[PDB]
Amino acid sequence: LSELVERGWAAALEPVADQVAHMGQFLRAEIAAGRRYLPAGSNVLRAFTFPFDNVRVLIVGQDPYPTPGHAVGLSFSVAPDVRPWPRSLANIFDEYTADLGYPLPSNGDLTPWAQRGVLLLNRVLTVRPSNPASHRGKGWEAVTECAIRALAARAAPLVAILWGRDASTLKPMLAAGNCVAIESPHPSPLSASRGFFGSRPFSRANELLVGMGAEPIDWRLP
Ligand SMILES: O=c1[nH]cc(O)c(=O)[nH]1
Ligand SMILES: O=c1[nH]cc(O)c(=O)[nH]1
Secondary structure (H helix, E strand, C coil): CCCCCCHHHHHHHHHHHHHHHHHHHHHHHHHHHCCCCECCHHHCCHHHCCCHHHCCEEEEECCCCCCCCCCCCCCCCCCCCCCCCCHHHHHHHHHHHHHHCCCCCCCCCCHHHHHCCEEEEECCCCECCCCCCCCCCCCCHHHHHHHHHHHHHCCCCEEEEEECHHHHCCHHHHCCCCEEEEEECCCCHHHHHHHHCCCCHHHHHHHHHHHCCCCCCCCCCC
């Protein structure tokens, strides 16, 4: 892993080295079968290329975007290029503006969040192109479970923003008093109107962080 991911993340993910390699073998066999995978191989583990020690907020999404160009190995982010935004990201940008009173971002690229210690983790790290949540139950779950347990274990505060019923089952792994869960319905249009709008997770996370003696997150995107 030492060559695929930042130093901290390589040590934290050591336990699932076997399983990362194994999911290597899965991507090879998908290309061989004529089904492909998003994101690019070089961006699958991309959420782990920013420092493990600097992570203070965990945003758990479920799967990479099914549309080529959307998925870039950071949950909810799209390529600077891409327009229009998937309605998921639009709904996240709605709430950002409502919560922080910033105007809408000029592109869909969330790397600045990654740079400031937001871990944009999908529970599953690949997807069959144009087929949503299609790589569930293949072996990613144990890899992203290992990442989360290792964040929760650190001598350091953590806010977990958990979007959707599925993301709420990760609460057991965050019971350690240094971790705090914010739960709401997923920003996907199917569920956005059931709780996500008005949920104020960006401002609440920073309140949480400051209460724990952590530096808050500059959420502002250009
Ligand atoms: O990266 C993501 N894209 C779209 C989603 O719905 C999600 O949960 N995660
Ligand atoms: O609409 C808004 N205006 C100003 C704010 O601070 C805010 O959080 N939301």
